[PDB]
Amino acid sequence: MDDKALLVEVQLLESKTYHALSNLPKARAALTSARTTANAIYCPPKLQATLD
Amino acid sequence: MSYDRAITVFSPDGHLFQVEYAQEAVKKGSTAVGVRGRDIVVLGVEKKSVAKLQDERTVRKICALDDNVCMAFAVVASVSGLTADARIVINRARVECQSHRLTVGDPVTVEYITRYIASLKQRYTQSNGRRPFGISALIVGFDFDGTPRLYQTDPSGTYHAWKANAIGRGAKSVREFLEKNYTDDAIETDDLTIKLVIKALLEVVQSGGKNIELAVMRRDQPLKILSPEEIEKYVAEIEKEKEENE
Amino acid sequence: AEVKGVCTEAGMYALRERRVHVTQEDFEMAVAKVMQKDSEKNMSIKKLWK
Amino acid sequence: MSRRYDSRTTIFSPEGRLYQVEYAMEAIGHAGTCLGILANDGVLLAAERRNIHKLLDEVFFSEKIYKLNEDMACSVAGITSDANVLTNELRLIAQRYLLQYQEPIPCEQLVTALCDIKQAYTQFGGKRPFGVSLLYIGWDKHYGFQLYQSDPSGNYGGWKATCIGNNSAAAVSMLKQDYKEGEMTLKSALALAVKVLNKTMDVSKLSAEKVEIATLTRENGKTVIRVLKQKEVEQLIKKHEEEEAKAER
Amino acid sequence: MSSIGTGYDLSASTFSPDGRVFQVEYAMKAVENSSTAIGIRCKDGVVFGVEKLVLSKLYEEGSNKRLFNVDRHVGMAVAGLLADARSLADIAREEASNFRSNFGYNIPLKHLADRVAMYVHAYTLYSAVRPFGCSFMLGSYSVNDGAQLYMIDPSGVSYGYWGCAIGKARQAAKTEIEKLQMKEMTCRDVVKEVAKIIYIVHDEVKDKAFELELSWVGELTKGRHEIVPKDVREEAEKYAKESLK
Amino acid sequence: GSSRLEGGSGGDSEVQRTMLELLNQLDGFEATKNIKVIMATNRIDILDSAL
Amino acid sequence: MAERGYSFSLTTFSPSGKLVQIEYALAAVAGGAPSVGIKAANGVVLATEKKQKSILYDERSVHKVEPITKHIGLVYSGMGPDYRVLVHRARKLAQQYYLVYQEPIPTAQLVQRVASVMQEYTQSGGVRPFGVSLLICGWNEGRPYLFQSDPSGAYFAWKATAMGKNYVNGKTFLEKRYNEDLELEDAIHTAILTLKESFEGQMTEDNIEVGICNEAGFRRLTPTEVRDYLAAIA
Amino acid sequence: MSRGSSAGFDRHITIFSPEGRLYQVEYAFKAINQGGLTSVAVRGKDCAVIVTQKKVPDKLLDSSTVTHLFKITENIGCVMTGMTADSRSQVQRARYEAANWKYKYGYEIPVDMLCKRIADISQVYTQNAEMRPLGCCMILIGIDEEQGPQVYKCDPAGYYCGFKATAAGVKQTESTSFLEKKVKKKFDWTFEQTVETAITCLSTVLSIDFKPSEIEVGVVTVENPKFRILTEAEIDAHLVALAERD
Amino acid sequence: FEMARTKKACLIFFDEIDAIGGARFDDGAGGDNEVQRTMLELINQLDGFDPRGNIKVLMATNRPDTLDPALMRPGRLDRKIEFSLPD
């Protein structure tokens, strides 16, 4: 399922964690991945605000 | 019923439209020839459009109304077989033949069937929201007498007896060649009558024994529809006779 | 038209990220954005352009 | 009022055709491949299954393979709508004949009863003709194995091999080219039918979701009517598919 | 519109975006063409006054009459086309006759009026037939239901009136009723009034010439619908003539 | 022009059918042709008898 | 009370070879309320929008979601009056069957019966076809069943289907959200989501009706139960 | 073509348009507006109420037998809005069916059974191209046994549905939206309260401002088994309270 | 019509009006407007407040079914004669 807000949320949380470890390629890759699934117009305004 | 919308309404030309539309559809094609013999009457249609992959045994374009009455039909278009249209006339005529034989102990004559065709076309005319069939039928059969007869009907419902007639693709052209072939010997010898039907069919377009189907009736005995294998042998023998006279 | 729409959508992303070269990341977001247009074309059973 | 609205499509044309039957004739052609081939131990029908999704219930045996009797089966080319009323009526007629005669009904006897009804609509009444043309397959005692085709006014023709639907000219010519009047057995007969369906149809490898093939086979003196299942169909697809592969070389 | 070959006046199943039905309306314009028939409810009966159209010079009484007896105690005055009126007389008389047979009491006008109206209304709905080209009044006296006046138009409405007019002059004629107190008033005095209204309203181009026919159904006739005596007609005629001068 | 199409098999097909007729026989330029008339359509319904 | 009826040709084939009336009837159902049917294989669930756009409608006994008989129900989309006669007619066939067999009519059998009616309306003149698409549900003879019958008189078999506005998107959302070999609970959840993907926005429990079908029977739940479900879905 | 299907048949007879729904059917809803009658019905827990014009136009028209509140039968009564010709016709058909039901079936008739039965009939009329979709709309009151007092309205289109509040007539849309504000700012329905709500909606919308002889109110009460018109006495007592309301 | 009246003896033979003479209606796309226009003009000068001048009129129609009630009454159609299929 990528046609959902919920998938965006996991990917964002993960990108924050790899960043802290200083697993920098991982955090970067995960951050683009969250934005790709965020594009869906099934996501409500708030989810978009947190994503920025 | 609820449908009473006009399909036929009378013309100042002194005709019924459908009947005339039907009559030209037998001018333009589906050669059906019949000759009357002296023991046996034979009718033949050319085209079942056997393209060498179709079945020949079960296809009927000559249908036995009775065991002493048979008809061969024609009317064509782009919708080439109007077998459906025929199939109604065939089923109602079949019961009526049998019915006439239950009531009246004489075997039903072709003259009864011909009046019955004239009334079916007409009845469809008078009834609201209804239209005449396009068929023309060559009604063959045997009377009380046991005399062979060939009668021909038109899409209006007018009938005449005729010794030999051809209809389709120039009714008059096929009949005037065939007119020479109708001689006293030809009508007497039964075998020569079978050839006369086939010999006419060949004038319009030549060859094919599968395209040609003909059914034979002898006395009051049941209809026998001939194998195509019997036809092929017969067209080959007809073609040589043409070279002999000429 | 849709296929070209991938490159075209990519450019919007490169400005946003503030790149000078259209990176791989720009393309990831673009396929998904173009897939949503396709989905709309199909829903409507008519073309998008009018 | 009423006649004016009536487009006079029930009128005869001078040429000797009915406008409606001709317009119905086109409705059959839009629609999918239905072909029947004669074989010498059984007879087979191959019809295009047009119900492909990954969420399908399959509440019916098939939506195009109809078993009309317990000795006849048929396939469809035309419109599903007409096919549903018609298919039911075909069942009462097949079944009543079975009661009286107690022998399998001729394929020819089966097209004719319906024909009256088809003709009735076209000529008068201003009623549409049925949008399907049916290929009936059967075995009856009298002729042995037979295939019959009906058209939108009930015009009938006995055929060894015939095809109606989408790319009807292509399917019938091709089948005419390899096979002419009953040169093959039941085994080979399924492999040609799927092959024809393959070329005609947009998917050029097929699956069992794309094709549905039905057999009617005379075993131990009694007619068995079976819709073959997806499993049996894949075997038949691999046999034709492989035969095509050799052709190229 | 009026010149057309599909729908409008061919049909009546048709609706305009306004909602109108033109055929039912054309039937209404048809009732308008001939002279007026008035029928006035009293608390004791109904009195009719009808113009009876003189269409020739070789007349006899009752010729082209518009006074019918639906039931013994119901009279029916028609206005508009007489062709349609004869068929309507048969249907109304028939519904009443069977009623008397079964129920065994004098047909309530409220019931009879509902049944004929339904019949007119079945035709206005239909595009399969045209609707009647006349409008009629049924008027009656009984002591089992009281004095009742009903009116049925080409549309298929039944509502009770206490004084009604149908025909050409009806908008003028109706006004003269508001002047009169007729709800409470003997049927003897009301005959004098229906006669004077008709004489003044008539003019030589609504119809050439008429014969005055008045009818009783009240305390005087004892609840019988009968035609008025020679005496009654003439005094009511006289009062009409004297008021006309 | 979707209205032209379902109306009687296209007003746009009308223009195509005529141009196709003109192009079938014209002057001495029937022999050589380097001017074609091309149609884009997506239906088979619109197609009249010459097409 | 004098008529013969009219039967006329606008119900015969056009030159295109397709029937003029059927296309228009399919347009009537597209304009309708969206309706999803999902066969769980643990029961059949049917969901529709309760609303008619004014919510001054009493609907505590008037529903869009009606049982035909003990465990077969119809949910519709499209035209309200035409559906009303089809509901009434469908019941009458069910009870006729009920007299003879003792079991209530199968969804497979019932559709053919209904289909004849749809057919008369197309093929004869002076009538017009019904513009209602039907989702027919049942659980009988050991398997739950979902059928579709469109307005022309075709019946199609689906295991998840969507209708009305954005019938196309519903079929794709069903393909995506719902997978095979999931349970009944999962089915109920997915239908309300298909209705979200098929007209979007605000929902109350008087804007939705949900009915569940088992061999226990078809029942349309009370307003409260439907309310709890709403909160689950996004 | 624009401005109706005049080169087409779609407003001439009943058949689906190129746009989906018929012109004719939509047009039937426009015939209601012609009647001049507007009805407002309000559902309570004491009675279900109808308020309609008693209004007479002359001395010559009765008011002792002219009413648009009709007693279909004792428990259930109705109001007709629109065309008067169609209005009577449905009332009689309804009355006969109500007696027949009670006689054969033996079940007492709720609001639903009359409403649904008429609605299915008015579907047949819409469906036939001989008959026309009705010129009137029927708003029924009557006591449902499970629910309580119920107000239903059936469409000339052939649809029935339940209503807590409804309006039909010339100002169909204006009155229903007005009454919507009254539902939203809810009233615990007493006897006097349902009657009051119905009259204020109609008085504001028409902008005549009614008095008690000009309206006639119809109740079917939980202690009245019969249908009764409240007439002027009760209406005036409410009427003054309406001026004091807001 | 004016030109006809001024000259000495005119016969205006209005040739073959089948649908070019048709009864007044409007479709809201163009309507019968243009057709009725000629028709109506001929009515206004003929009857008018001035009568028909020195103008004789002959009408050829195959359809009187189409024509307006104004044309069919006399003052330009005094006698109707059917020249149809012969005896």
PDB file of N, CA and C in Angstrom, chain D residues 1-2 5-7 9 20 23-24 26-27 30 51 53-60 63 80-82 84-85 88 91 121 126-130, chain G residues 6 8-17 19 39 112 116 119 122-123 143 145-147 152-160 171 174-175 180:
ATOM      1  N   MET D   1     -48.507  10.318 -34.391  1.00  0.00           N
ATOM      2  CA  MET D   1     -47.415  10.068 -33.404  1.00  0.00           C
ATOM      3  C   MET D   1     -46.618   8.759 -33.529  1.00  0.00           C
ATOM      4  N   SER D   2     -47.144   7.557 -33.174  1.00  0.00           N
ATOM      5  CA  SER D   2     -46.476   6.286 -33.054  1.00  0.00           C
ATOM      6  C   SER D   2     -45.683   5.757 -34.283  1.00  0.00           C
ATOM      7  N   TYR D   5     -42.319   7.776 -34.972  1.00  0.00           N
ATOM      8  CA  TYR D   5     -41.275   7.373 -34.144  1.00  0.00           C
ATOM      9  C   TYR D   5     -40.687   6.059 -34.616  1.00  0.00           C
ATOM     10  N   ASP D   6     -41.626   5.157 -35.152  1.00  0.00           N
ATOM     11  CA  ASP D   6     -41.213   3.867 -35.683  1.00  0.00           C
ATOM     12  C   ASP D   6     -40.384   4.058 -36.873  1.00  0.00           C
ATOM     13  N   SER D   7     -39.076   3.797 -36.808  1.00  0.00           N
ATOM     14  CA  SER D   7     -38.165   4.114 -37.881  1.00  0.00           C
ATOM     15  C   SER D   7     -38.290   3.347 -39.170  1.00  0.00           C
ATOM     16  N   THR D   9     -37.814   0.039 -39.548  1.00  0.00           N
ATOM     17  CA  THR D   9     -36.696  -0.845 -39.659  1.00  0.00           C
ATOM     18  C   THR D   9     -37.174  -2.264 -39.809  1.00  0.00           C
ATOM     19  N   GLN D  20     -32.495  -4.813 -39.602  1.00  0.00           N
ATOM     20  CA  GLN D  20     -32.151  -5.215 -38.265  1.00  0.00           C
ATOM     21  C   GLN D  20     -31.201  -6.329 -38.129  1.00  0.00           C
ATOM     22  N   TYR D  23     -27.749  -5.203 -38.954  1.00  0.00           N
ATOM     23  CA  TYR D  23     -27.164  -4.385 -37.851  1.00  0.00           C
ATOM     24  C   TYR D  23     -26.745  -5.289 -36.638  1.00  0.00           C
ATOM     25  N   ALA D  24     -27.574  -6.377 -36.379  1.00  0.00           N
ATOM     26  CA  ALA D  24     -27.244  -7.443 -35.452  1.00  0.00           C
ATOM     27  C   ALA D  24     -26.037  -8.192 -35.868  1.00  0.00           C
ATOM     28  N   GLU D  26     -23.295  -7.177 -37.335  1.00  0.00           N
ATOM     29  CA  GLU D  26     -22.207  -6.311 -36.832  1.00  0.00           C
ATOM     30  C   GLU D  26     -21.980  -6.455 -35.347  1.00  0.00           C
ATOM     31  N   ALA D  27     -23.076  -6.629 -34.491  1.00  0.00           N
ATOM     32  CA  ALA D  27     -22.959  -6.867 -33.080  1.00  0.00           C
ATOM     33  C   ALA D  27     -22.246  -8.110 -32.681  1.00  0.00           C
ATOM     34  N   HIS D  30     -18.256  -7.521 -33.276  1.00  0.00           N
ATOM     35  CA  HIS D  30     -17.484  -6.723 -32.352  1.00  0.00           C
ATOM     36  C   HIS D  30     -16.898  -7.594 -31.303  1.00  0.00           C
ATOM     37  N   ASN D  51     -13.706 -12.396 -18.806  1.00  0.00           N
ATOM     38  CA  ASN D  51     -13.856 -12.078 -17.370  1.00  0.00           C
ATOM     39  C   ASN D  51     -12.483 -12.402 -16.815  1.00  0.00           C
ATOM     40  N   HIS D  53      -9.880 -10.868 -13.986  1.00  0.00           N
ATOM     41  CA  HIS D  53      -9.511  -9.998 -12.906  1.00  0.00           C
ATOM     42  C   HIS D  53      -8.881 -10.963 -12.004  1.00  0.00           C
ATOM     43  N   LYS D  54      -8.375 -10.497 -10.823  1.00  0.00           N
ATOM     44  CA  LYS D  54      -7.695 -11.397  -9.880  1.00  0.00           C
ATOM     45  C   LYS D  54      -8.724 -11.641  -8.737  1.00  0.00           C
ATOM     46  N   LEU D  55      -9.868 -10.982  -8.657  1.00  0.00           N
ATOM     47  CA  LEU D  55     -10.860 -11.071  -7.757  1.00  0.00           C
ATOM     48  C   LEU D  55     -11.974 -11.499  -8.634  1.00  0.00           C
ATOM     49  N   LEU D  56     -12.283 -12.799  -8.754  1.00  0.00           N
ATOM     50  CA  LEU D  56     -13.443 -13.381  -9.525  1.00  0.00           C
ATOM     51  C   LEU D  56     -13.967 -14.469  -8.669  1.00  0.00           C
ATOM     52  N   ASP D  57     -15.325 -14.490  -8.517  1.00  0.00           N
ATOM     53  CA  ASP D  57     -16.025 -15.496  -7.712  1.00  0.00           C
ATOM     54  C   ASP D  57     -16.165 -16.835  -8.429  1.00  0.00           C
ATOM     55  N   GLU D  58     -16.672 -16.700  -9.692  1.00  0.00           N
ATOM     56  CA  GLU D  58     -16.930 -17.924 -10.542  1.00  0.00           C
ATOM     57  C   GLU D  58     -18.158 -18.598  -9.947  1.00  0.00           C
ATOM     58  N   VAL D  59     -19.245 -17.823  -9.866  1.00  0.00           N
ATOM     59  CA  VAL D  59     -20.562 -18.307  -9.424  1.00  0.00           C
ATOM     60  C   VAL D  59     -21.263 -19.119 -10.431  1.00  0.00           C
ATOM     61  N   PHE D  60     -20.813 -19.080 -11.708  1.00  0.00           N
ATOM     62  CA  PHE D  60     -21.400 -19.826 -12.776  1.00  0.00           C
ATOM     63  C   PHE D  60     -20.338 -20.835 -13.155  1.00  0.00           C
ATOM     64  N   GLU D  63     -19.363 -17.922 -17.935  1.00  0.00           N
ATOM     65  CA  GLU D  63     -20.282 -16.904 -18.474  1.00  0.00           C
ATOM     66  C   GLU D  63     -20.382 -16.954 -19.999  1.00  0.00           C
ATOM     67  N   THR D  80     -23.673 -10.182 -23.977  1.00  0.00           N
ATOM     68  CA  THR D  80     -23.963 -11.011 -22.797  1.00  0.00           C
ATOM     69  C   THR D  80     -25.448 -10.862 -22.413  1.00  0.00           C
ATOM     70  N   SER D  81     -26.070  -9.727 -22.621  1.00  0.00           N
ATOM     71  CA  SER D  81     -27.430  -9.377 -22.191  1.00  0.00           C
ATOM     72  C   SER D  81     -28.478 -10.278 -22.796  1.00  0.00           C
ATOM     73  N   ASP D  82     -28.387 -10.365 -24.151  1.00  0.00           N
ATOM     74  CA  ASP D  82     -29.233 -11.213 -24.993  1.00  0.00           C
ATOM     75  C   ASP D  82     -28.908 -12.619 -24.685  1.00  0.00           C
ATOM     76  N   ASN D  84     -28.154 -14.193 -21.826  1.00  0.00           N
ATOM     77  CA  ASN D  84     -28.776 -14.656 -20.642  1.00  0.00           C
ATOM     78  C   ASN D  84     -30.221 -15.087 -20.655  1.00  0.00           C
ATOM     79  N   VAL D  85     -31.125 -14.330 -21.334  1.00  0.00           N
ATOM     80  CA  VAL D  85     -32.566 -14.718 -21.547  1.00  0.00           C
ATOM     81  C   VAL D  85     -32.673 -15.857 -22.453  1.00  0.00           C
ATOM     82  N   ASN D  88     -31.598 -19.292 -21.093  1.00  0.00           N
ATOM     83  CA  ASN D  88     -32.604 -19.959 -20.368  1.00  0.00           C
ATOM     84  C   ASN D  88     -33.655 -20.637 -21.182  1.00  0.00           C
ATOM     85  N   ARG D  91     -32.583 -23.852 -22.827  1.00  0.00           N
ATOM     86  CA  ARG D  91     -32.724 -24.911 -21.827  1.00  0.00           C
ATOM     87  C   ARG D  91     -34.151 -25.448 -21.793  1.00  0.00           C
ATOM     88  N   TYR D 121     -39.416 -10.967 -34.416  1.00  0.00           N
ATOM     89  CA  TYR D 121     -38.975  -9.695 -33.917  1.00  0.00           C
ATOM     90  C   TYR D 121     -38.673  -8.807 -35.109  1.00  0.00           C
ATOM     91  N   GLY D 126     -41.128  -4.668 -34.040  1.00  0.00           N
ATOM     92  CA  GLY D 126     -40.273  -3.579 -33.726  1.00  0.00           C
ATOM     93  C   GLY D 126     -39.486  -3.792 -32.517  1.00  0.00           C
ATOM     94  N   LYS D 127     -39.092  -5.104 -32.356  1.00  0.00           N
ATOM     95  CA  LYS D 127     -38.495  -5.651 -31.243  1.00  0.00           C
ATOM     96  C   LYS D 127     -37.130  -5.955 -31.789  1.00  0.00           C
ATOM     97  N   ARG D 128     -36.045  -5.822 -30.934  1.00  0.00           N
ATOM     98  CA  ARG D 128     -34.698  -6.028 -31.377  1.00  0.00           C
ATOM     99  C   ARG D 128     -34.458  -7.453 -31.584  1.00  0.00           C
ATOM    100  N   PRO D 129     -33.540  -7.889 -32.409  1.00  0.00           N
ATOM    101  CA  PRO D 129     -33.290  -9.311 -32.490  1.00  0.00           C
ATOM    102  C   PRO D 129     -32.247  -9.537 -31.433  1.00  0.00           C
ATOM    103  N   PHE D 130     -32.060 -10.843 -31.029  1.00  0.00           N
ATOM    104  CA  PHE D 130     -31.029 -11.151 -30.142  1.00  0.00           C
ATOM    105  C   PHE D 130     -29.679 -10.876 -30.696  1.00  0.00           C
TER     106      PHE D 130
ATOM    107  N   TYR G   6     -48.401   1.356 -27.362  1.00  0.00           N
ATOM    108  CA  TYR G   6     -47.548   1.664 -28.555  1.00  0.00           C
ATOM    109  C   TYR G   6     -46.256   0.952 -28.343  1.00  0.00           C
ATOM    110  N   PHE G   8     -42.774   0.745 -30.722  1.00  0.00           N
ATOM    111  CA  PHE G   8     -42.208   1.443 -31.821  1.00  0.00           C
ATOM    112  C   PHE G   8     -40.753   1.255 -31.709  1.00  0.00           C
ATOM    113  N   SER G   9     -40.069   1.446 -32.889  1.00  0.00           N
ATOM    114  CA  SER G   9     -38.672   1.354 -33.126  1.00  0.00           C
ATOM    115  C   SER G   9     -37.824   2.582 -32.682  1.00  0.00           C
ATOM    116  N   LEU G  10     -37.428   2.609 -31.382  1.00  0.00           N
ATOM    117  CA  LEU G  10     -36.237   3.323 -30.902  1.00  0.00           C
ATOM    118  C   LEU G  10     -35.612   2.197 -30.069  1.00  0.00           C
ATOM    119  N   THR G  11     -36.099   0.951 -30.155  1.00  0.00           N
ATOM    120  CA  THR G  11     -35.602  -0.033 -29.345  1.00  0.00           C
ATOM    121  C   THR G  11     -34.983  -1.167 -30.167  1.00  0.00           C
ATOM    122  N   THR G  12     -34.886  -0.890 -31.487  1.00  0.00           N
ATOM    123  CA  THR G  12     -34.274  -1.720 -32.508  1.00  0.00           C
ATOM    124  C   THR G  12     -32.891  -1.236 -32.701  1.00  0.00           C
ATOM    125  N   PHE G  13     -32.005  -2.037 -33.428  1.00  0.00           N
ATOM    126  CA  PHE G  13     -30.592  -1.694 -33.599  1.00  0.00           C
ATOM    127  C   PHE G  13     -30.346  -0.459 -34.391  1.00  0.00           C
ATOM    128  N   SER G  14     -29.270   0.352 -34.016  1.00  0.00           N
ATOM    129  CA  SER G  14     -28.875   1.421 -34.853  1.00  0.00           C
ATOM    130  C   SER G  14     -27.919   0.755 -35.883  1.00  0.00           C
ATOM    131  N   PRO G  15     -27.475   1.530 -36.866  1.00  0.00           N
ATOM    132  CA  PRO G  15     -26.468   1.187 -37.873  1.00  0.00           C
ATOM    133  C   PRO G  15     -25.126   0.885 -37.263  1.00  0.00           C
ATOM    134  N   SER G  16     -24.753   1.417 -36.090  1.00  0.00           N
ATOM    135  CA  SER G  16     -23.489   1.222 -35.391  1.00  0.00           C
ATOM    136  C   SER G  16     -23.416  -0.286 -34.935  1.00  0.00           C
ATOM    137  N   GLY G  17     -24.567  -0.921 -34.639  1.00  0.00           N
ATOM    138  CA  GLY G  17     -24.551  -2.311 -34.355  1.00  0.00           C
ATOM    139  C   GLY G  17     -24.672  -2.531 -32.877  1.00  0.00           C
ATOM    140  N   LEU G  19     -26.889  -1.141 -29.202  1.00  0.00           N
ATOM    141  CA  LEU G  19     -28.243  -0.800 -28.958  1.00  0.00           C
ATOM    142  C   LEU G  19     -28.260   0.600 -28.380  1.00  0.00           C
ATOM    143  N   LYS G  39     -17.159 -10.044  -1.562  1.00  0.00           N
ATOM    144  CA  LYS G  39     -17.303 -11.386  -0.960  1.00  0.00           C
ATOM    145  C   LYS G  39     -16.096 -11.638  -0.167  1.00  0.00           C
ATOM    146  N   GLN G 112     -31.027 -14.488 -13.180  1.00  0.00           N
ATOM    147  CA  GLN G 112     -31.552 -14.799 -14.504  1.00  0.00           C
ATOM    148  C   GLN G 112     -32.986 -14.346 -14.593  1.00  0.00           C
ATOM    149  N   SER G 116     -34.644 -11.277 -17.194  1.00  0.00           N
ATOM    150  CA  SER G 116     -35.732 -11.335 -18.152  1.00  0.00           C
ATOM    151  C   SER G 116     -36.525 -10.041 -18.159  1.00  0.00           C
ATOM    152  N   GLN G 119     -34.651  -7.219 -19.771  1.00  0.00           N
ATOM    153  CA  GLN G 119     -34.714  -7.548 -21.171  1.00  0.00           C
ATOM    154  C   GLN G 119     -36.005  -7.112 -21.803  1.00  0.00           C
ATOM    155  N   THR G 122     -35.904  -3.375 -22.540  1.00  0.00           N
ATOM    156  CA  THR G 122     -35.115  -3.005 -23.625  1.00  0.00           C
ATOM    157  C   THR G 122     -35.817  -3.392 -24.956  1.00  0.00           C
ATOM    158  N   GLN G 123     -36.114  -4.662 -25.204  1.00  0.00           N
ATOM    159  CA  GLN G 123     -36.477  -5.255 -26.482  1.00  0.00           C
ATOM    160  C   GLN G 123     -37.833  -4.833 -26.998  1.00  0.00           C
ATOM    161  N   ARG G 143     -21.229 -21.738   0.335  1.00  0.00           N
ATOM    162  CA  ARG G 143     -20.292 -20.754  -0.124  1.00  0.00           C
ATOM    163  C   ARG G 143     -20.997 -19.398  -0.142  1.00  0.00           C
ATOM    164  N   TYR G 145     -21.725 -15.677  -1.839  1.00  0.00           N
ATOM    165  CA  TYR G 145     -21.767 -15.391  -3.271  1.00  0.00           C
ATOM    166  C   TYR G 145     -22.071 -13.923  -3.423  1.00  0.00           C
ATOM    167  N   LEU G 146     -21.546 -13.313  -4.531  1.00  0.00           N
ATOM    168  CA  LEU G 146     -21.671 -11.966  -4.958  1.00  0.00           C
ATOM    169  C   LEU G 146     -21.816 -12.136  -6.408  1.00  0.00           C
ATOM    170  N   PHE G 147     -22.867 -11.387  -6.921  1.00  0.00           N
ATOM    171  CA  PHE G 147     -23.202 -11.326  -8.319  1.00  0.00           C
ATOM    172  C   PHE G 147     -23.404  -9.791  -8.517  1.00  0.00           C
ATOM    173  N   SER G 152     -28.692  -3.500 -18.576  1.00  0.00           N
ATOM    174  CA  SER G 152     -29.023  -4.034 -19.906  1.00  0.00           C
ATOM    175  C   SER G 152     -29.774  -5.372 -19.766  1.00  0.00           C
ATOM    176  N   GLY G 153     -29.314  -6.220 -18.764  1.00  0.00           N
ATOM    177  CA  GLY G 153     -29.856  -7.558 -18.563  1.00  0.00           C
ATOM    178  C   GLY G 153     -28.734  -8.522 -18.551  1.00  0.00           C
ATOM    179  N   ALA G 154     -27.463  -8.070 -18.697  1.00  0.00           N
ATOM    180  CA  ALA G 154     -26.231  -8.850 -18.371  1.00  0.00           C
ATOM    181  C   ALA G 154     -26.065  -8.996 -16.877  1.00  0.00           C
ATOM    182  N   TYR G 155     -25.510 -10.183 -16.506  1.00  0.00           N
ATOM    183  CA  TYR G 155     -25.071 -10.525 -15.198  1.00  0.00           C
ATOM    184  C   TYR G 155     -23.607 -10.935 -15.334  1.00  0.00           C
ATOM    185  N   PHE G 156     -22.799 -10.378 -14.375  1.00  0.00           N
ATOM    186  CA  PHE G 156     -21.394 -10.647 -14.348  1.00  0.00           C
ATOM    187  C   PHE G 156     -20.999 -11.067 -12.930  1.00  0.00           C
ATOM    188  N   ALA G 157     -20.004 -11.988 -12.881  1.00  0.00           N
ATOM    189  CA  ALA G 157     -19.485 -12.510 -11.642  1.00  0.00           C
ATOM    190  C   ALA G 157     -18.211 -11.832 -11.298  1.00  0.00           C
ATOM    191  N   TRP G 158     -18.229 -11.303 -10.075  1.00  0.00           N
ATOM    192  CA  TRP G 158     -17.028 -10.612  -9.506  1.00  0.00           C
ATOM    193  C   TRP G 158     -16.870 -10.971  -8.081  1.00  0.00           C
ATOM    194  N   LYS G 159     -15.756 -10.749  -7.448  1.00  0.00           N
ATOM    195  CA  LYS G 159     -15.576 -11.135  -6.052  1.00  0.00           C
ATOM    196  C   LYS G 159     -15.367  -9.860  -5.312  1.00  0.00           C
ATOM    197  N   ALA G 160     -15.093  -8.854  -6.016  1.00  0.00           N
ATOM    198  CA  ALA G 160     -15.060  -7.507  -5.424  1.00  0.00           C
ATOM    199  C   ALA G 160     -15.424  -6.684  -6.494  1.00  0.00           C
ATOM    200  N   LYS G 171     -12.735  -0.272  -8.227  1.00  0.00           N
ATOM    201  CA  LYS G 171     -12.286  -1.599  -8.672  1.00  0.00           C
ATOM    202  C   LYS G 171     -10.811  -1.677  -8.439  1.00  0.00           C
ATOM    203  N   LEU G 174      -9.915  -1.768  -4.531  1.00  0.00           N
ATOM    204  CA  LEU G 174     -10.313  -3.130  -4.094  1.00  0.00           C
ATOM    205  C   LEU G 174      -9.251  -4.147  -4.399  1.00  0.00           C
ATOM    206  N   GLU G 175      -8.660  -3.986  -5.589  1.00  0.00           N
ATOM    207  CA  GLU G 175      -7.577  -4.774  -6.055  1.00  0.00           C
ATOM    208  C   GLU G 175      -6.328  -4.648  -5.144  1.00  0.00           C
ATOM    209  N   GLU G 180      -6.778 -11.647  -1.142  1.00  0.00           N
ATOM    210  CA  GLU G 180      -7.526 -12.879  -0.944  1.00  0.00           C
ATOM    211  C   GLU G 180      -7.018 -13.559   0.292  1.00  0.00           C
TER     212      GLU G 180
END
